[PDB]
UniProtKB/Swiss-Prot annotation, chain A:
Residues 4-279 form the Protein kinase domain. Binds 2 Mg(2+) ions. The modification N-acetylmethionine is found at M1. It comes from Homo sapiens. The gene is CDK2. Keywords: Acetylation, ATP-binding, Cell cycle, Cell division, Cytoplasm, Cytoskeleton, DNA damage, DNA repair, Endosome, Kinase, Magnesium, Meiosis, Metal-binding, Mitosis, Nucleotide-binding, Nucleus, Phosphoprotein, S-nitrosylation, Serine/threonine-protein kinase, Transferase. This is Cyclin-dependent kinase 2. The lineage of its organism: Eukaryota, Metazoa, Chordata, Craniata, Vertebrata. The modification N6-acetyllysine is found at K6. It is found in: Cytoplasm, Cytoskeleton, Microtubule organizing center, Centrosome; Nucleus, Cajal body; Cytoplasm; Endosome. The record marks K9, K81, K82, L159 as: CDK7 binding. SUPFAM superfamilies: Protein kinase-like (PK-like).
Swiss-Prot record, chain B:
Binds to the catalytic subunit of the cyclin dependent kinases and is essential for their biological function. The lineage of its organism: Eukaryota, Metazoa, Chordata, Craniata, Vertebrata. This is Cyclin-dependent kinases regulatory subunit 1. One of its GO terms (cellular component) is SCF ubiquitin ligase complex. InterPro entries: Cyclin-dep_kinase_reg-sub, Cyclin-dep_kinase_reg-sub_sf. The keyword Flavoprotein does not apply. Forms a homohexamer that can probably bind six kinase subunits. PANTHER family: CYCLIN-DEPENDENT KINASES REGULATORY SUBUNIT/60S RIBOSOME SUBUNIT BIOGENESIS PROTEIN NIP7. GO terms for biological process: cell division; regulation of mitotic cell cycle.
Length: 287, 70
């Protein structure tokens, strides 16, 4: 850990603090994340250094020193939450949005092929650069650390992007949870506000139901197998997407609709999402 | 304390949920639906007609209320 100088604090993730640093040997800027390891998990994350893709934040190195675990990774100037916060009076150009989702599905498609999930995908672990690229951070860390109700700085974590199966108590959940979280990020990138901002797990479920209709055996076969399903949930009907996500075109709605499908089995995969008509005209404009 | 949610409706019911503080929450039995006298006893100020109809097990401190429309 002695090779990292010029260390400045950038922010706070849900696992630890994030810094911008300088590699004394190479002279490059790097990002470090100090996850306080109070009490296998390291050897497994080191293996994540082997999963490289232009859309996966590069895990440069893992370092364990006296109760601290440092993730040295590729440095990107901003995340999607901040980028959307700043583009509030103009939003994001549809071409950039189509470019981002496209690159996001190639990173998901890459990681899923290797049975690596994220499970806690939020706009905050979606990192951007000045060249029009977007990359995923923190893949595979949740299956070592597990994602909590509260963070390390006791901040309240984000339920907003959780899949309905996770919320209804499914223990045997898919990689389709990531496609759900990404379908939420897609709509939010389009409307600039979270599609389902619930204040509790039950409110998050109700939020989902109000927009997409309350699930049943017709729209979600096997929904009655979910530990937390109750036949008394408020009864709502599926709303019209032309209303929910106005700027989006028919192809954009069709895909969002398929990424947000209730049944994990029927929910579009990253691989098949890439071949969707929506991406027929994808470009790559700068941020 | 006690957070009272915004009311929300569907075709034949009106709803709302109430989040309970750690103190009051220790007074609510495990898998038990309450009567007005029972939830009112907890401090929940609400009009008459509201029915504690469901319990989301993972968050037993959230009381879910229902009431038929109109």
């Amino acid at each position: 850990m002695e090779n990292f100088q010029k260390v400045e604090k950038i922010g706070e993730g849900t696992y630890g603090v994030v810094y911008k640093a300088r590699n004394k040997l190479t002279g490059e800027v790097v990002a470090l994340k100090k996850i306080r390891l109070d009490t296998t998990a390291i050897r497994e994350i080191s293996l994540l250094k082997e999963l490289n893709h232009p859309n996966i934040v590069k895990l440069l190195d893992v370092i364990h020193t006296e109760n601290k675990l440092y993730l040295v990774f590729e440095f990107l100037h901003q995340d999607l939450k901040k980028f959307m916060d700043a583009s509030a009076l103009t939003g994001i150009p549809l071409p950039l949005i189509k470019s981002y989702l496209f690159q996001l599905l190639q990173g998901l498609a890459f990681c899923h092929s290797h049975r690596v999930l994220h499970r806690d995908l939020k706009p905050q672990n979606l990192l951007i650069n000045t060249e029009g690229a977007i990359k995923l951070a923190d893949f595979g860390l949740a299956r070592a650390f597990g994602v909590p109700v509260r963070t390390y700085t006791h901040e309240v974590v984000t339920l907003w992007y959780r899949a309905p199966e996770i919320l209804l108590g499914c223990k045997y959940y898919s990689t389709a949870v990531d496609i759900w979280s990404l379908g939420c990020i897609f709509a939010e990138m389009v409307t600039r506000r979270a599609l389902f901002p619930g204040d509790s797990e039950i409110d998050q479920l109700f939020r989902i139901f109000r927009t997409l209709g309350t699930p049943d055996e017709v729209v979600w076969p096997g929904v009655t197998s979910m530990p937390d399903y109750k036949p008394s949930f408020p009864k709502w009907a599926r709303q019209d997407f032309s209303k929910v996500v106005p700027p989006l075109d028919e192809d954009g709605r069709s895909l969002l609709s398929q990424m947000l499908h209730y049944d994990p089995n029927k929910r579009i995969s990253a691989k098949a999402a890439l071949a969707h008509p929506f991406f027929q005209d994808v470009t790559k404009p700068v941020p | 304390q006690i957070y009272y949610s915004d009311k929300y409706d569907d075709e034949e019911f009106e709803y709302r949920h109430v989040m309970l503080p750690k103190d009051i929450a220790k007074l609510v039995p495990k898998t038990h639906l309450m009567s007005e006298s029972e939830w009112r006893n907890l401090g929940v100020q609400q009009s008459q007609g509201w029915v504690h109809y469901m319990i989301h097990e993972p968050e037993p401190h959230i009381l879910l209320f229902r009431r038929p429309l109109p």
